[PDB]
Amino acid sequence: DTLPVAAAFTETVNAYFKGADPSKCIVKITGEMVLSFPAGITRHFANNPSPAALTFRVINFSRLEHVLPNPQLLCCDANTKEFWVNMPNLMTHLKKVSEQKPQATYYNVDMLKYQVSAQGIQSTPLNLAVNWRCEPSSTDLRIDYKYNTDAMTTAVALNNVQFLVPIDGGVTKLQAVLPPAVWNAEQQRILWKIPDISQKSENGGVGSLLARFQLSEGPSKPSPLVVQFTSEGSTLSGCDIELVGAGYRFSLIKKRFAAGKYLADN
C-alpha cells in the first residue's frame, strides 16, 4: 500500500510601521513546515521495518534564510532543496507519541523552522499608516490601511482583522467614529474589527479608520496600534512541497499565514 501524508506551511509576519514613512518599516517573517501522519502508520511500520524512503523537495527554497531542519529527522543547489527523512528516528518518534496519545487520529511533526527574506513594506500584507493629532483636551486618530497583494504568492483574504489602540489622557467620550468601533473603558483602549479584507472587499482593500476623543486629564501620548489577522490558502514565502520517489502521496497541503507582532507608531 501507499501511505497518505499531509503537509502545512505556517508563516508569521511581524511588521513595525513609523508614521507615513515606508523606509522606516521593519519586517520579519518566520515560518514552520510541518508534516502530519495518520495513526495507521504505526501498524504499517510494524508491517515493514524497511519502509519506502520518505523524500521530499521544497520549491522556492532560496526565498528562505536562517533555515533550521529538525535535528533528529534531517540535515546530514539553487532554488530547490531536497531532503531524505531519517526513518528509524521517525518510526521511533511516532511510536512514542502514539503510545502516549492513543486516541490521536493523526500526529504532527515539526520538520523545518525558517525565516523568509522580506524587503520592507512590499513584503507586508496589510500596509499601515497612523496619524495622531493630540490637543490638550482633544485627540484625533487616523489609521490608513491598504491590502497589499504583492506580499503574498496568491491573492487571498485577510480574516478576523483587529485594530487595537490604547488612548491616554483620561478619555471621557468619543465622537465621530467611522466605521463603528468598541470602547473598552477598563483598559482605556479602542478596538475596530473587520471580518474580511481582500481585493473583493468594500473598497479594493484600501480604507481608513477615524476617531475623536474628549479628554479630562490631557493631552494624550500616542500609543502603538496593534493589529491581528489570519489567512488561509497562501504563503508569504512562495514555498510549496513535492514528494520525490514512491511510497507516499500528499492528501492535503495546507498553506496559511498570520500577523505576529504587527505595530504602527505615530
Binding site: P4, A6, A8, T10, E32, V34, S36, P38, T105, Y106, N108, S251, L252, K254, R256
Partner: peptide, 10 residues
C-alpha cells in the same frame, strides 16, 4: 498549535 485545525486525513 495545530496547522490543520482538525484531521487532514478523514
Amino acid at each position: 498549535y495545530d496547522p490543520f485545525g482538525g484531521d487532514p486525513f478523514k
